[PDB]
Amino acid sequence: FVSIAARQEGAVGIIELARPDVLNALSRQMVAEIVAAVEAFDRNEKVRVIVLTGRGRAFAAGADIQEMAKDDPIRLEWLNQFADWDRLSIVKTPMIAAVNGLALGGGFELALSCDLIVASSAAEFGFPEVNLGVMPGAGGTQRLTKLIGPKRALEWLWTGARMSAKEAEQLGIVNRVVSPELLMEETMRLAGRLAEQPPLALRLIKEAVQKAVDYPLYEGMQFERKNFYLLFASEDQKEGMAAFLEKRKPRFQGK
Template identity: 75%
Template sequence: MSEFAHIDTRTEGAVAVIELNRPHVFNALNRQMVTEIVTAMEAYDRNDDVRVIVLAGKGRAFAAGADIDEMANDDPITLELLNQFAEWDRMALIKKPTIAAVHGFALGGGFELALSCDLLFAAETAEFGFPEVNIGVMPGAGGTQRLTKLIGKTKALEWLWTGERMSAATAYELGIVNRVVVPELLLEETMKFAQKIAKQPPLSIRLIKEAVHKAVDYPLYEGMQFERKNFYLLFASEDQKEGMQAFVEKRKPHFKGK
């Protein structure tokens, strides 16, 4: 995918890597960049050779936030008609596992982008935060919602109201980050984990992701009904037959995603 101006893309085996590439502005997210990220994600989501998508940033940071210069003169009607956050909604429709590898800092829109991924790996020196309040606005691409669902109302309000930065260690303690690693090994460790998930049966991974996302919003009973249907659905797959047959025959299964 060489048509992009603000991101680089590549595949390593069954893992696709999308790297934010505006290092001169710490990967500040302008609207075109967000469109490119979503477009690349959707293309990899449709690519049968790709099983996991990793999102990372070039240069000294993951992403410094939204491009303030681009929106400083906007008004409510302009923003309503532009409907820029519809692009972010498309990220939530990606079926394959997405993992963010965060170094430097992920602030504002950069933090929202990281939270849009299923899992989050961070360098020990990484910092997270929503500084929007300091310039008279607030997160608009899901920050108040995703953070609250992850860490609860009172903790979320503390970080959103103060605009302060949290360390990778604090983000880990709050359950935002899955793994904290030394900066030099961030991408290597993220890729190692991604390759591990890529070896799992793709349909199981897909339907597990779908069910877990429902668990965040559904009452328990409705969530369990949804889980049950996905459980049943997997029994129509070749991978289920192969997985159980391999278990009986005491051999390693070979999953095809069918």
């Protein structure tokens, strides 16, 4: 990898966007590297939580104008660049975005692709694409609308204004906000705690929640209970209940 840096801390896999010189611009090349790194950690059973963050003052900006200016309808159709974003959408391992700063355009879409977002006070979220005559093309219009409704979503999407970390939290987009120098420490502590939970339970709960966002209630519950049944095939289910009865901490192994 030449645009990102990956490392592991216990059962937590960290992917740090490493192009601060261009504010970690999410060019097609950068996205491809992120997808490759995330899928690698997703396949590694030693990794229970994946954390995405950016180096420097920005989390991630969108693709640069020079790259976008080369495009036209047909070139984009053949490029099918958003298929890479779809791959990010189906990652099953828990993913947390530690937004250390600007998360604009593709950057905002990357954070929204994660399951939880821990943000610094230095963070700002927005979709400035409209001011360039275009629009978000990687789920931005979809995920934002589902989270805050069409009335509020259109305000942000049509104006391209930046949303502070605080309002993002009030809207339910961001889970918590902390000072810049405490961001990674707090995020890793949270990831560490999640890494102590039953891996299969976190995985199947996430799948159920994904369906809850799209599925009609009855069918979402139909899927939900199937995952419920499946968890009773795990040794972790036996361990969790034995630990509860013995009044001791459970020691989940992801099986």
